[PDB]
Amino acid sequence: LQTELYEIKHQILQTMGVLSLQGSMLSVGDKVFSTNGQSVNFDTIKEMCTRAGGNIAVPRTPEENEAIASIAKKYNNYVYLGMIEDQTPGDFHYLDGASVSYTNWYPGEPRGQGKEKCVEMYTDGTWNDRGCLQYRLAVCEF
Amino acid sequence: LQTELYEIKHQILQTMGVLSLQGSMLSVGDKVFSTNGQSVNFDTIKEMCTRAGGNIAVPRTPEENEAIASIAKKYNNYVYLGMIEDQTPGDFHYLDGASVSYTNWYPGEPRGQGKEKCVEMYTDGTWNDRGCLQYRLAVCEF
Amino acid sequence: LQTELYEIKHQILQTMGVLSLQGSMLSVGDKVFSTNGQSVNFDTIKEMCTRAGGNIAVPRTPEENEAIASIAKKYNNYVYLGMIEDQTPGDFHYLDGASVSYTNWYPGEPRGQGKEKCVEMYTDGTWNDRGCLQYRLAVCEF
Numbered sequence: 001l002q003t004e005l006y007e008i009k010h011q012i013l014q015t016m017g018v019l020s021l022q023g024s025m026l027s028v029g030d031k032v033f034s035t036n037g038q039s040v041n042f043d044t045i046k047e048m049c050t051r052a053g054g055n056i057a058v059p060r061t062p063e064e065n066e067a068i069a070s071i072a073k074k075y076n077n078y079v080y081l082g083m084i085e086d087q088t089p090g091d092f093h094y095l096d097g098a099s100v101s102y103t104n105w106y107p108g109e110p111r112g113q114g115k116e117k118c119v120e121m122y123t124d125g126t127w128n129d130r131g132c133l134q135y136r137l138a139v140c141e142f
Numbered sequence: 143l144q145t146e147l148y149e150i151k152h153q154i155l156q157t158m159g160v161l162s163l164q165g166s167m168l169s170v171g172d173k174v175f176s177t178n179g180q181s182v183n184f185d186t187i188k189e190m191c192t193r194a195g196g197n198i199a200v201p202r203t204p205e206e207n208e209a210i211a212s213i214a215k216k217y218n219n220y221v222y223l224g225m226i227e228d229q230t231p232g233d234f235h236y237l238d239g240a241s242v243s244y245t246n247w248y249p250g251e252p253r254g255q256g257k258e259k260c261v262e263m264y265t266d267g268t269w270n271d272r273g274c275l276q277y278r279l280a281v282c283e284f
Numbered sequence: 285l286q287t288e289l290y291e292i293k294h295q296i297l298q299t300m301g302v303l304s305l306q307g308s309m310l311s312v313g314d315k316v317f318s319t320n321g322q323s324v325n326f327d328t329i330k331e332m333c334t335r336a337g338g339n340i341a342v343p344r345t346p347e348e349n350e351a352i353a354s355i356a357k358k359y360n361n362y363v364y365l366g367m368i369e370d371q372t373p374g375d376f377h378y379l380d381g382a383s384v385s386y387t388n389w390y391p392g393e394p395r396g397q398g399k400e401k402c403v404e405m406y407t408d409g410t411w412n413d414r415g416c417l418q419y420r421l422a423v424c425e426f
């Protein structure tokens with residue numbers, strides 16, 4: 001059993017290593033980030049991530065944020081994050097409903113005045129509140 | 143132990159998620175379909191799949207069939223399936239020897255009269271009996 | 285439990301199968317080889333492999349050697365191996381410090397006279413001792 005678990009864990013690290021080495025994904029803690037390289041709107045990204053068994057990416061730590069930023073930088077495009085504006089303007093929540101804890105707004109943001117209910121990440125990693133209909137890099141977390 | 147199994151299962155879903163998101167494979171039930179994008183003959187596909195630890199794909203449900211059809215459609219090529227004609231013309235078997243259950247013949251097929259011992263899938267998902275020497279998209283199941 | 289371990293092992297083989305079929309890696313025994321396709325110096329390859337959770341590749345059997353050779357052949361470039369010269373010229377060690385067992389030197393090699401502390405693999409699989417600053421295919425083992 002112990003010999004079987006080792007082998008299983010070894011093989012997992014091998015496949016994760018291969019995917020990591022080839023830039024197919026980024027591992028941060030227990031979270032894995034990945035993109036299909038496509039630029040689509042918020043609703044479309046949501047579907048793509050869930051179809052793959054994951055969710056539209058959302059950073060909850062500075063290290064997770066930088067990981068997504070590096071992907072945004074790599075593809076030279078902004079990234080829609082897994083959060084939307086509440087009823088009260090300026091207040092945002094994760095898709096499960098919980099209010100956002102970690103934030104990294106670009107100075108002055110959010111200021112869409114309730115008209116920009118989605119959140120995009122600039123290539124430097126800072127956030128901007130934005131309409132949900134733009135074409136943005138699809139980044140998922142697993 | 144339970145904490146170790148969760149982590150293992152979590153990491154598996156992560157790697158499967160990454161491969162899924164990037165179109166490297168399709169998951170249907172307990173079956174995974176994948177292609178190397180190459181177009182070769184029946185014998186060559188057989189070898190490639192087994193070298194990868196899998197088998198030349200064969201659909202046994204409508205959902206498995208549509209999955210392979212989507213790959214055929216994606217690469218704009220027909221797909222050799224994991225089945226060949228018996229001694230009696232019009233009767234086909236899986237490679238283990240068992241007679242074919244689920245079928246999706248294009249109307250009028252099979253009618254190769256025993257001269258077309260292999261089976262190819264059109265891009266709409268329907269089947270045609272065919273000679274085994276054509277260049278076809280290599281699709282494997284794992 | 286036994287049903288859970290089977291499923292886990294099945295899914296592992298599926299992901300390994302997909303990666304194998306698509307040429308993303310080579311499996312030899314319990315060792316997996318992979319490349320990101322990049323050509324950089326020894327120190328850079330070392331870092332890339334360890335960042336992915338692996339190590340710069342080193343063959344310890346003829347089958348492992350041929351596996352790496354095939355990758356070298358595929359990318360038409362030589363490969364830096366995971367070994368460097370001791371203080372005594374002509375003597376080489378693995379990166380953990382242990383002296384090299386299996387070798388496959390091209391005839392006459394090594395003869396860098398202590399000036400060529402790294403080891404490169406030619407596309408035919410044979411070894412040459414070389415300076416560590418050249419651009420070589422980055423191949424990792426996991």
Ligand SMILES: C[N+](C)(C)CCOP(=O)(O)O
Binds near residue numbers: 134
């Ligand atoms: C996509 N882009 C961020 C590089 C520029 C275009 O952005 P946008 O027109 O959707 O606001």
Ligand SMILES: C[N+](C)(C)CCOP(=O)(O)O
Binds near residue numbers: 218219220277
């Ligand atoms: C490959 N193709 C199906 C698109 C057309 C050619 O098919 P075939 O000549 O092998 O019968």
Ligand SMILES: C[N+](C)(C)CCOP(=O)(O)O
Binds near residue numbers: 362
């Ligand atoms: C890279 N190469 C092996 C194909 C030729 C150049 O090699 P080198 O100039 O680094 O010695």
Ligand SMILES: [Ca+2]
Binds near residue numbers: 111
């Ligand atoms: Ca804004």
Ligand SMILES: [Ca+2]
Binds near residue numbers: 258
């Ligand atoms: Ca026919």
Ligand SMILES: [Ca+2]
Binds near residue numbers: 393394396412413414
């Ligand atoms: Ca030399």
Ligand code: NA
Binds near residue numbers: 085089
């Ligand atoms: Na707003």
Ligand code: NA
Binds near residue numbers: 232259
């Ligand atoms: Na026939």
Ligand code: NA
Binds near residue numbers: 374394397398400413
């Ligand atoms: Na030397």
